[PDB]
Design an enzyme around this catalytic site. Structure first.
Site, PDB file in Angstrom:
ATOM      1  N   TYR A  76      26.865  33.552  33.827  1.00  0.00           N
ATOM      2  CA  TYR A  76      25.899  34.254  33.122  1.00  0.00           C
ATOM      3  C   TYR A  76      26.606  35.579  33.257  1.00  0.00           C
ATOM      4  O   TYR A  76      26.086  36.540  32.570  1.00  0.00           O
ATOM      5  CB  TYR A  76      24.393  34.242  33.438  1.00  0.00           C
ATOM      6  CG  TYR A  76      23.846  33.031  33.552  1.00  0.00           C
ATOM      7  CD1 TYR A  76      23.897  32.250  34.420  1.00  0.00           C
ATOM      8  CD2 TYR A  76      22.982  32.703  32.283  1.00  0.00           C
ATOM      9  CE1 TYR A  76      23.114  30.833  34.116  1.00  0.00           C
ATOM     10  CE2 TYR A  76      22.267  31.610  32.346  1.00  0.00           C
ATOM     11  CZ  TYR A  76      22.483  30.687  33.344  1.00  0.00           C
ATOM     12  OH  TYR A  76      21.642  29.598  33.150  1.00  0.00           O
TER      13      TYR A  76
HETATM   14  C1  F43 Z   1      25.594  24.931  35.752  1.00  0.00           C
HETATM   15  C2  F43 Z   1      24.319  25.591  36.367  1.00  0.00           C
HETATM   16  C3  F43 Z   1      24.756  26.956  36.905  1.00  0.00           C
HETATM   17  C4  F43 Z   1      24.432  28.047  35.859  1.00  0.00           C
HETATM   18  O1  F43 Z   1      25.161  28.859  35.875  1.00  0.00           O
HETATM   19  N1  F43 Z   1      23.715  27.512  34.983  1.00  0.00           N
HETATM   20  C5  F43 Z   1      23.178  26.114  35.298  1.00  0.00           C
HETATM   21  C6  F43 Z   1      23.199  25.222  33.944  1.00  0.00           C
HETATM   22  C7  F43 Z   1      22.364  26.064  32.516  1.00  0.00           C
HETATM   23  C8  F43 Z   1      22.358  25.497  31.395  1.00  0.00           C
HETATM   24  C9  F43 Z   1      22.136  23.951  31.315  1.00  0.00           C
HETATM   25  C10 F43 Z   1      22.697  23.487  30.070  1.00  0.00           C
HETATM   26  C11 F43 Z   1      23.334  22.158  30.200  1.00  0.00           C
HETATM   27  O2  F43 Z   1      22.701  21.206  31.103  1.00  0.00           O
HETATM   28  O3  F43 Z   1      24.451  21.701  29.690  1.00  0.00           O
HETATM   29  C12 F43 Z   1      21.386  26.196  30.808  1.00  0.00           C
HETATM   30  C13 F43 Z   1      20.265  25.475  29.753  1.00  0.00           C
HETATM   31  C14 F43 Z   1      21.638  27.735  30.098  1.00  0.00           C
HETATM   32  C15 F43 Z   1      22.535  27.358  28.865  1.00  0.00           C
HETATM   33  N2  F43 Z   1      23.907  27.520  29.068  1.00  0.00           N
HETATM   34  O4  F43 Z   1      22.308  27.171  27.795  1.00  0.00           O
HETATM   35  C16 F43 Z   1      20.501  26.744  31.996  1.00  0.00           C
HETATM   36  N3  F43 Z   1      21.037  26.401  33.085  1.00  0.00           N
HETATM   37 NI1  F43 Z   1      20.066  25.964  35.017  1.00  0.00          NI
HETATM   38  N4  F43 Z   1      18.325  25.789  33.793  1.00  0.00           N
HETATM   39  C17 F43 Z   1      17.086  25.468  34.408  1.00  0.00           C
HETATM   40  C18 F43 Z   1      16.664  25.456  35.870  1.00  0.00           C
HETATM   41  C19 F43 Z   1      17.545  25.106  37.035  1.00  0.00           C
HETATM   42  C20 F43 Z   1      17.252  24.775  38.244  1.00  0.00           C
HETATM   43  C21 F43 Z   1      16.844  23.244  37.846  1.00  0.00           C
HETATM   44  C22 F43 Z   1      16.392  22.596  39.360  1.00  0.00           C
HETATM   45  C23 F43 Z   1      16.031  20.980  39.283  1.00  0.00           C
HETATM   46  O5  F43 Z   1      15.585  20.715  40.250  1.00  0.00           O
HETATM   47  O6  F43 Z   1      16.037  20.393  38.146  1.00  0.00           O
HETATM   48  C24 F43 Z   1      18.535  24.937  38.924  1.00  0.00           C
HETATM   49  C25 F43 Z   1      18.303  26.132  39.791  1.00  0.00           C
HETATM   50  C26 F43 Z   1      17.436  25.742  41.013  1.00  0.00           C
HETATM   51  O7  F43 Z   1      17.760  25.031  41.955  1.00  0.00           O
HETATM   52  O8  F43 Z   1      16.411  26.522  41.140  1.00  0.00           O
HETATM   53  C27 F43 Z   1      19.777  25.235  37.684  1.00  0.00           C
HETATM   54  C28 F43 Z   1      20.726  24.882  37.986  1.00  0.00           C
HETATM   55  C29 F43 Z   1      21.962  25.303  37.038  1.00  0.00           C
HETATM   56  N5  F43 Z   1      21.869  25.892  35.876  1.00  0.00           N
HETATM   57  C30 F43 Z   1      23.446  24.833  37.333  1.00  0.00           C
HETATM   58  C31 F43 Z   1      23.340  23.207  37.263  1.00  0.00           C
HETATM   59  C32 F43 Z   1      22.545  22.461  38.297  1.00  0.00           C
HETATM   60  C33 F43 Z   1      22.777  21.002  37.974  1.00  0.00           C
HETATM   61  O9  F43 Z   1      24.037  20.629  38.543  1.00  0.00           O
HETATM   62  O10 F43 Z   1      22.059  20.220  37.656  1.00  0.00           O
HETATM   63  N6  F43 Z   1      18.709  25.355  36.697  1.00  0.00           N
HETATM   64  C34 F43 Z   1      15.109  25.314  35.956  1.00  0.00           C
HETATM   65  O11 F43 Z   1      14.709  25.694  37.313  1.00  0.00           O
HETATM   66  C35 F43 Z   1      14.004  25.090  35.067  1.00  0.00           C
HETATM   67  C36 F43 Z   1      14.540  25.717  33.600  1.00  0.00           C
HETATM   68  C37 F43 Z   1      15.989  25.062  33.155  1.00  0.00           C
HETATM   69  C38 F43 Z   1      16.656  26.045  32.082  1.00  0.00           C
HETATM   70  C39 F43 Z   1      16.391  25.281  30.642  1.00  0.00           C
HETATM   71  C40 F43 Z   1      14.835  25.655  30.211  1.00  0.00           C
HETATM   72  O12 F43 Z   1      14.329  26.728  30.539  1.00  0.00           O
HETATM   73  O13 F43 Z   1      14.469  25.019  29.081  1.00  0.00           O
HETATM   74  C41 F43 Z   1      17.986  25.846  32.453  1.00  0.00           C
HETATM   75  C42 F43 Z   1      18.907  27.044  31.911  1.00  0.00           C
HETATM   76  C1  LIG Z   2      25.060  41.156  33.944  1.00  0.00           C
HETATM   77  C2  LIG Z   2      25.734  41.405  32.641  1.00  0.00           C
HETATM   78  O1  LIG Z   2      26.851  40.678  32.184  1.00  0.00           O
HETATM   79  P1  LIG Z   2      28.341  41.315  32.708  1.00  0.00           P
HETATM   80  O2  LIG Z   2      28.515  41.001  34.265  1.00  0.00           O
HETATM   81  O3  LIG Z   2      28.434  42.605  32.384  1.00  0.00           O
HETATM   82  O4  LIG Z   2      29.306  40.286  32.027  1.00  0.00           O
HETATM   83  C3  LIG Z   2      24.730  41.292  31.430  1.00  0.00           C
HETATM   84  N1  LIG Z   2      24.274  39.757  31.342  1.00  0.00           N
HETATM   85  C4  LIG Z   2      23.032  39.329  31.837  1.00  0.00           C
HETATM   86  O5  LIG Z   2      22.210  40.388  32.270  1.00  0.00           O
HETATM   87  C5  LIG Z   2      22.659  38.082  31.764  1.00  0.00           C
HETATM   88  C6  LIG Z   2      21.006  38.063  31.382  1.00  0.00           C
HETATM   89  C7  LIG Z   2      20.752  36.764  30.927  1.00  0.00           C
HETATM   90  C8  LIG Z   2      21.329  35.439  31.466  1.00  0.00           C
HETATM   91  C9  LIG Z   2      20.672  35.343  33.032  1.00  0.00           C
HETATM   92  C10 LIG Z   2      19.362  34.763  33.008  1.00  0.00           C
HETATM   93  S1  LIG Z   2      18.486  34.785  34.576  1.00  0.00           S
HETATM   94  C11 LIG Z   2      25.389  41.604  30.077  1.00  0.00           C
HETATM   95  O6  LIG Z   2      25.730  40.357  29.555  1.00  0.00           O
HETATM   96  O7  LIG Z   2      25.621  42.457  29.666  1.00  0.00           O
HETATM   97  O1  LIG Z   3      22.759  27.509  39.541  1.00  0.00           O
HETATM   98  S1  LIG Z   3      22.089  28.789  38.927  1.00  0.00           S
HETATM   99  O2  LIG Z   3      21.003  29.460  39.701  1.00  0.00           O
HETATM  100  O3  LIG Z   3      23.218  29.956  39.304  1.00  0.00           O
HETATM  101  C1  LIG Z   3      21.585  28.688  37.300  1.00  0.00           C
HETATM  102  C2  LIG Z   3      20.186  28.762  36.997  1.00  0.00           C
HETATM  103  S2  LIG Z   3      19.833  28.579  35.287  1.00  0.00           S
END
Ligand code: F43
Ligand SMILES: C[C@@H](OP(=O)(O)O)[C@H](NC(=O)CCCCCCS)C(=O)O
Ligand SMILES: O=S(=O)(O)CCS
Ligand SMILES: C[C@@H](OP(=O)(O)O)[C@H](NC(=O)CCCCCCS)C(=O)O
Ligand SMILES: [Mg+2]
Ligand SMILES: [Xe]
Ligand SMILES: [Xe]
Ligand SMILES: [Xe]
Ligand SMILES: [Xe]
Ligand SMILES: [Xe]
EC number: 2.8.4.1
Lengths: 547, 243, 442, 442
Positions: C366
């Site tokens: 992010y």
């Molecule tokens: C690649 C990451 C690292 C990162 O920066 N973002 C990810 C992935 C990203 C992607 C997943 C899209 C896809 O599947 O292609 C999106 C949707 C954001 C996006 N780019 O659109 C997202 N997560 Ni994440 N992500 C979520 C969540 C979570 C929870 C899931 C835990 C579980 O047990 O399933 C954990 C964090 C944690 O452990 O607390 C998590 C991790 C992660 N999150 C791990 C992948 C973990 C894995 O290998 O499965 N998300 C959630 O906790 C619920 C909501 C959910 C979001 C989608 C929605 O809100 O509908 C999504 C929000």
């Molecule tokens: C931190 C900052 O990003 P940079 O580190 O400046 O690349 C900022 N994004 C965010 O705060 C991401 C918020 C939404 C995605 C995370 C949700 S938990 C932004 O895009 O300006």
């Molecule tokens: O695995 S990470 O907690 O960094 C992504 C949450 S959507």
């Protein structure tokens, strides 16, 4: 019965208490009507454009578990989560557009300029003539120049200008088509408070076309509003079409007596006015109109604000503006689906009501340690006793937000003060973290760990009442699962107190308007209607496009 | 060191995981080759890829006082191992791991999430740590899993065999043997030969060893002394931020 | 003196330099070396004469991948760098005997410029340094080769970039440590918008010198922001001394006692022992086989805990020789020490909170990046008021080459030019001397 | 001295004060009074103790029409202003008997605060003045009444407003002349983001004193922006002297000779005569019944033309006693003088261009406003580099009450507090005296 039992029974065949189920034999994405629709649509998209698009075989195979339906809280509508994605939900898009295209502009300085600098009279009759003039010009039509080309009235049918005032006699003399009637929209005690706050002031509520708001940005609203206010002032009060005094109306409309929905943001997250990051939690609570229709149920009022903020702040703001892609749909739906947060918060309300009575508790750390701890333990135990509930809100972040929102709102029900409610929010996080040896995602509790010490700080970029904070508060600027719930905690003590507004009475009145497209009195009901593809948004280009 | 307050089995289990003088109970035997196979960073016998030349190839009192780990001396890449812990009485839990990792291991980069927990360090030192993480009571082949991605399952219901959900099914329970076999590495690539992970712990031993509070085990609200310290920290944090 | 506290000052080798130094002798408001450090950062500009020549020669000006075909100018700027730099100094200086300094580096490919302090005595902020330097070198290049009126605008674009169409000096061939005032997260943040890589680059990867300088900049900004005013002033001074200045050799001794085999948890245990030994903390209450510690001096406990936090970074990230684990150290040193003692962690949780997001935004998708690209003005790392960034400076100094965005990639012009100033390259030296010289004036 | 020019200095009454003063004695980089004016503006803050009390009593904090029901605090702040201001000064000051100044005004309803210069010697910009002042009075009010931990955040909101949720101090009850650094149109613009009404308010509507102060601020910013560097430095010093400082009594004499019956065209004719009389311009070519004038010193012709521009504003807008016509004067004085002489107008057309948009954005619908709401950092009036805004300050000073957005409406707190400092209220006095004292050091 717990309020979430019915939704859990609709989701899974097993009993909510069962710890075991079967996986991998559900057919993957083929179990889902919505995923099936997406696969067929992705094939048509790729075929028509010649580039691959949606493909269920990319990456990991969705649907090894139950792809759950969701009950929209306070309704009986069950949808798949994809229907609550803001891209797929026209009600959610229109809710933000209705906020983005709104601005509040006073008439008090302008009327003073008319009478003093121009030496002309202002009466309810002149105000009506001005309002009839501005409602022609505001959508984009001419009043002065020759050979002007204009916007199609049907493409901009949602743009208009209304006025309100605390003076009932003045309000009755203005043409009622242009008046937001405070006495008809708010209950008696709330109407008297709002009318006392506004006084003799006359305020315009301007809404610019949705099609312009979608084409441009939020910073367009106050500028578009000012131009057409200025042209209508020129026409209605017979000014020279460009003299010295005309500059006063422009400065008045653009700076002097204007209330933006959102203030502009700093450079790292560079954005103009009327973007979600600039909307403070107090404004968001007042934009939501649950306060004037559910004023006897402070839980219902507080949670409608949570739904408003969770969708706007997490799905649209943080999930798109600040990130994007699949987004944060289920990060937010945890706060307004399956009656889960409702059950937790109604528990804390009854606990506070029986022990203290609403707003009767001391405003100190003792009430925080008591109420927040009791509600948190109740909420976390529901996940421990109902495995279907823990599998439902599978993300720790989701659960932390729901549990702490109930603990925060309940503490605010007790103290009648939003700041001690905020302290209960962070205590809930600390207890939650220790109970399950987990909390949220990798960076969920940045603000949560900064939280306790910054609740009552008074330093430059740390100290602020919760009503004044927003998505630009430094600790809050980045992370999902907080901002929408903070808006609910801001509403919580005022709903329990019976207050007509949380932070700005003009904002509260500005959305008590039946000519809005989105119904802010029934936010969750509108979300369900948009998920069912039954919502009629503004700003479509169908009239200027082929059949 | 006290590590953690409380009078429950959970509180004592958290102190045991953090205390480096507590010898972790070994529950299974795993070969060195299998650990390298489970990690999936290199093939057994493959040389360690280097991100920078060895240290031997400026003047600083800190550099001269802090003995670097063997992988940093050689310039190994920084690789990872990541575990998912079921909330149904898995022995280790996310914050318990990170707290324990930074008490027991040198040069550790630990991260805590609800659905996964990761440690990053030099590649050859990671292999030494992963052996203890996989063989000892840190790990149970049914309620815990090695997952580099698609970690969904920590909060889900178990399957008919008591196994945690795994989208990629990296760990397979054998009904004929009563033992768990790992057929893929932590990232999801199929292994040439599965790795025996032993039998799953029964529910009686799980509750004795678990570090998560639950109502059907030991509730956090019943460990009144542990809750007291957390409430104390909340109050002291609030007062310190104010004055 | 407003405070009675005194501290013993040491050098970057663990040797005692001055005993019983008043606490306020290290204050940015009083220490003359810190004043020279802040003012030096404001007025120092690096000019890339080779970059200006190459941009003009190729007409590649105004941002990445930008070029205007037909505008090329072939000027031997580096060959005449001595005459050009002398002509620019004549315009930069106020008088012949002010503190104006213009030095060439790399055989004329670079230029170190220090705008005289007299211009800042009548300026509101710090932008005079790049703006006066840029226009002086633009005019000097034009006068040197008699660039015509019709081509001179290309010299301006090569020096200052796309400004003012862009808000920043987009594509400029000059560099400073501060960024434009518009990019401040808030008022008073300018001394925080200094990339950690800039500090690590110009400190030449010395751990203690980078840690000291980062703490000097972070806590000095706390005064400009008003955080170190009144009730909180002693807390920030104690943190500056014990965490950044190695007061009482606490950071140095802890690193030495845990450098060969120690971990983060062992540094915590020794710190609690040392704090209990020095009367900073005492057993306030006993639970079941658990001692609850209390204190009558939260500011001093925070300083001791902050000292152990710095040492834990040096032990943990020093052993790995990789900076990335500093975000984990900043998190769980504070997490473990709270449940070890029952006292609040450093900055009353703000370092742990900063570390949570810093861990996330350096291990995900992010945003953020490597530990070297962060700073006190980043949205991710602005929340702790000076107690977290200094640990990152020490960690990035120990990194043996595991970062894609290292100081060599983002601060190349800084490491070559700003390291030449002895105040910034070895700031621990001058600040300790200044505190001793003013110890009897406080 | 870099330049050979010398000027004769006069007072606001047309009386000679000092003859043959080197030009650079009036330079912001050299004049000690200009240094005192700039540094005073950076460190001066007005505190509205009555506004803070009313905000707390009504819980109306955080912006227009904002209120939090149930948060009201009844504190007698104005009744205890002596104790509150004394406690705040103790936190604001660095040492005893430094240049910290805290004075009560309006029987304690207002407070003049001057933050000590020592805090700015270690600061990058100017935000320390409001940030230190706000937190000192917040802490002083909390200590005075023992405001509880649960209520203190309302005192913070009453003083500094919605910051940091808003970027500005939205709803604050403190005021300065400078705005936050984020609102600069560009780097170096901070001394330009001073509203014309702010200058006219604290000059108490004296024309020459407002013109001098506006020119002092505008041209000093030209040094910080780098515009007054090298080839252009003499032009800005000459413009500062002749247009804003009444050098050689040229503005005064032109106003005197055309005050009873003169117009803009008559001021032009006399100015062209004076320039031809003083050898500044000469007949270069003759067309058919038309003399084409030339010059060998464009900077000096620009200064003379700039003097007549100021005088034409004083004659035209003074006769009308309405400031609005200044936009017309700034335009057509320059338009007429170019076809009268064949020489470029003031700032080589930039004053005429600024006047075109200034006329437009003060007589239309698209923005702007009255003449008093503009400043050097406004997008409409930033284009001329110091030669146009001073005429607006002189015009608004002559306005007899025809403006809705006068300084009384937008600068009330400035008119009451910032006018109390003698340096700001009468800057023509101190700058002329300081130039004479340093005339033999230039
Ligand atoms: C690649 C990451 C690292 C990162 O920066 N973002 C990810 C992935 C990203 C992607 C997943 C899209 C896809 O599947 O292609 C999106 C949707 C954001 C996006 N780019 O659109 C997202 N997560 Ni994440 N992500 C979520 C969540 C979570 C929870 C899931 C835990 C579980 O047990 O399933 C954990 C964090 C944690 O452990 O607390 C998590 C991790 C992660 N999150 C791990 C992948 C973990 C894995 O290998 O499965 N998300 C959630 O906790 C619920 C909501 C959910 C979001 C989608 C929605 O809100 O509908 C999504 C929000
Ligand atoms: C931190 C900052 O990003 P940079 O580190 O400046 O690349 C900022 N994004 C965010 O705060 C991401 C918020 C939404 C995605 C995370 C949700 S938990 C932004 O895009 O300006
Ligand atoms: O695995 S990470 O907690 O960094 C992504 C949450 S959507
Ligand atoms: C002048 C300035 O407005 P303010 O004076 O700051 O209200 C500016 N608008 C504009 O430039 C309007 C441009 C479009 C209307 C004029 C087109 S000729 C702006 O909003 O930033
Ligand atoms: Mg409807
Ligand atoms: Xe309400
Ligand atoms: Xe540096
Ligand atoms: Xe950090
Ligand atoms: Xe002023
Ligand atoms: Xe102007």
């Amino acid at each position: 019965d717990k309020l979430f039992i019915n939704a859990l029974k609709k989701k899974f065949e097993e009993s909510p208490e069962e710890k075991k189920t079967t996986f991998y034999t559900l057919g993957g994405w083929k179990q889902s009507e919505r995923k099936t629709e997406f696969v067929n649509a992705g094939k048509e998209v790729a075929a028509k454009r010649g580039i691959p698009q949606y493909n269920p075989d990319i990456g990991t195979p969705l649907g090894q578990r139950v792809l759950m339906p969701y009950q929209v809280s306070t309704t009986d509508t069950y949808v798949e989560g994809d229907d609550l994605h803001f891209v797929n939900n026209a009600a959610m898009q229109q809710m933000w557009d209705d906020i983005r295209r709104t601005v509040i502009v006073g008439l008090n300085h302008a009327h003073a300029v008319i009478e003093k600098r121009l030496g002309k009279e202002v009466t309810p009759e002149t105000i009506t003539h001005y309002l009839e003039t501005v409602n022609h010009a505001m959508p984009g039509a001419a009043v002065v120049q020759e050979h002007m080309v204009e916007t199609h009235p049907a493409l901009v049918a949602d743009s208009y200008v209304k006025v309100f005032t605390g003076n009932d006699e003045i309000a009755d003399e203005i043409d009622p088509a242009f008046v937001i009637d405070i006495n008809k929209q708010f209950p008696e005690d709330q109407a008297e408070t709002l009318k006392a706050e506004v006084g003799d002031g006359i305020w315009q509520v301007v809404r610019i076309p949705t099609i312009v708001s979608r084409t441009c940005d939020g910073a367009t609203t106050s500028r578009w509003s000012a131009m057409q206010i200025g042209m209508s002032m020129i026409s209605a009060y017979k000014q020279a079409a460009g003299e010295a005094a005309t500059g006063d109306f422009a400065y008045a409309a653009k700076h002097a007596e204007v209330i933006h929905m959102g203030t502009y943001l700093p450079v790292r997250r560079a954005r103009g006015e009327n973007e979600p990051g600039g909307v403070p939690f107090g404004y968001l609570a007042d934009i939501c109109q649950s306060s004037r229709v559910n004023y006897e149920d402070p839980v219902r009022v507080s949670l409608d604000v949570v739904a408003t903020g969770a969708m706007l702040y997490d799905q649209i703001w943080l999930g798109s503006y600040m990130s994007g892609g699949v987004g944060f749909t289920q990060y937010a739906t945890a706060a307004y689906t399956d009656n889960i947060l409702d059950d937790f918060t109604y528990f804390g309300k009854e606990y506070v009501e029986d022990k203290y009575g609403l707003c009767e508790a001391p405003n100190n750390m003792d009430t925080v340690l008591d109420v927040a701890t009791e509600v948190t333990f109740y909420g976390l135990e529901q996940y421990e006793e109902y495995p279907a509930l823990l599998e439902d809100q599978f993300g720790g972040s989701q659960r932390a937000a729901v549990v702490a929102a109930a603990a925060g709102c309940s503490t605010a029900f007790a103290t009648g003060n939003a700041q001690t409610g905020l302290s209960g929010w962070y205590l809930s996080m600390y207890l939650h973290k220790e109970q399950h040896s987990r909390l949220g995602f990798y960076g969920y509790d940045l603000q949560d760990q900064c939280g306790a010490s910054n609740v009552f700080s008074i330093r430059g970029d740390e100290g602020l009442p919760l009503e004044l904070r927003g998505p630009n508060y430094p600790n809050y600027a980045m992370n999902v699962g907080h901002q929408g719930e903070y808006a609910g905690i801001s509403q919580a003590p005022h709903a329990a107190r019976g207050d007509a507004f949380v932070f700005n009475p003009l904002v509260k009145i500005a959305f008590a308007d039946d000519n809005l497209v989105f119904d802010f009195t029934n936010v969750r009901g509108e979300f369900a209607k948009g998920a069912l593809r039954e919502f009629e948004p503004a700003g479509e280009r169908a009239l200027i496009t082929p059949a | 060191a006290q590590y953690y307050p409380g009078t429950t089995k959970v509180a004592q289990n958290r102190r045991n995981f953090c205390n480096p003088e507590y010898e972790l109970e070994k529950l299974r035997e795993i070969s060195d080759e299998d650990v390298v196979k489970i990690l999936g960073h290199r093939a057994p016998g493959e040389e360690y890829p280097s991100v920078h030349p060895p240290l031997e190839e400026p003047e600083d009192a800190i550099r001269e006082m802090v003995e670097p780990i063997d992988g940093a001396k050689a310039g190994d890449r920084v690789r990872y191992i990541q575990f998912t812990d079921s909330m149904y009485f898995a022995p280790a839990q996310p914050y318990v791991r990170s707290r324990a990792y930074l008490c027991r291991y040198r040069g550790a980069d630990a991260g805590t999430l609800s659905g996964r927990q990761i440690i990053e360090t030099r590649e050859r030192d990671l292999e030494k740590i992963s052996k203890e993480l996989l063989e000892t009571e840190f790990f149970d082949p049914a309620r815990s899993g090695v997952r580099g991605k698609s970690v969904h399952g920590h909060s889900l219901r178990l399957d008919e065999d008591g196994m945690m959900f795994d989208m990629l099914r990296r760990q397979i329970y054998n009904k004929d043997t009563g033992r768990v076999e790992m057929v893929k590495n932590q990232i999801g690539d199929e292994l040439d030969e599965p790795v025996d992970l032993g039998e799953p712990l029964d529910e009686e031993t799980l509750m004795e060893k678990t570090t998560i509070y639950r109502v059907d085990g030991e509730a956090y609200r019943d460990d009144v002394e542990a809750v007291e310290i957390m409430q104390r920290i909340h109050v002291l944090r609030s007062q310190g931020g104010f004055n | 003196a407003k405070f009675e506290d005194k501290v013993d000052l040491y050098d970057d080798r663990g040797n005692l330099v001055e005993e019983q130094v008043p606490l306020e002798a290290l204050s940015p408001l009083r220490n003359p070396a810190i004043k020279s450090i802040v003012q030096g950062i404001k007025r120092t500009v690096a000019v890339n004469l080779e970059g200006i020549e190459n941009a003009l020669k190729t007409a590649k000006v105004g941002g990445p991948a930008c070029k205007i075909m037909g505008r090329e100018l072939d000027l031997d700027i580096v060959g005449n760098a001595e005459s050009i730099a002398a002509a620019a100094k004549e315009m930069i200086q106020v008088t012949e005997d002010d503190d104006t300094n213009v030095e060439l580096l790399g055989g004329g490919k670079r230029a170190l410029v220090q705008v005289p302090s007299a211009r800042f005595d009548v300026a509101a902020e710090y932008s005079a340094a790049p703006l006066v330097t840029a226009t002086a070198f633009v005019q000097a290049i034009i006068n040197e080769f008699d660039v015509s009126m019709y081509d001179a605008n290309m010299v301006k674009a090569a020096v200052l970039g796309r400004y003012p169409q862009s808000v920043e000096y987009m594509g400029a061939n000059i560099a400073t440590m501060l960024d434009i005032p518009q990019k401040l997260e808030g008022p008073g943040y300018a001394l925080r918008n200094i990339m950690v890589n800039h500090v690590v680059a110009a400190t030449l990867k010395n751990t203690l010198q980078a840690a000291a300088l980062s703490t000097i900049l972070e806590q000095t900004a706390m005064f400009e922001m008003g955080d170190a005013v009144g009730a909180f002033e002693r807390m920030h001074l104690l943190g500056l001394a014990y965490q950044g200045m190695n007061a009482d050799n606490l950071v140095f001794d802890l690193v030495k006692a845990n450098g060969k085999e120690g971990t983060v948890g062992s540094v915590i245990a020794d710190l609690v022992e040392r704090a209990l030994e020095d009367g900073v903390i005492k057993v306030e209450k006993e639970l079941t086989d658990y001692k609850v510690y209390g204190t009558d001096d939260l500011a001093m406990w925070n300083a001791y805990a902050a000292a152990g936090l710095m040492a834990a970074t040096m032990v943990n990230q020093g052993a790995a020789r990789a900076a990335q684990g500093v975000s984990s150290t900043l998190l769980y040193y504070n997490d473990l020490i709270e449940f070890e003692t029952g006292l609040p962690s450093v900055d009353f949780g703000k370092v742990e909170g900063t570390a949570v997001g810093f861990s996330f935004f350096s291990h995900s998708i992010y945003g953020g990046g490597g530990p070297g690209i962060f700073n006190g003005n980043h949205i991710v790392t602005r929340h702790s008021k000076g107690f977290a960034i200094p640990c990152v400076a020490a960690a990035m100094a120990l990194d043996a080459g595991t970062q894609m965005f290292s100081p060599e990639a983002t601060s190349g012009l800084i490491k070559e030019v700003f390291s030449q100033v002895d105040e910034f390259r070895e700031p621990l030296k001058y600040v300790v001397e200044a505190a001793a010289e003013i110890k009897n004036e406080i």
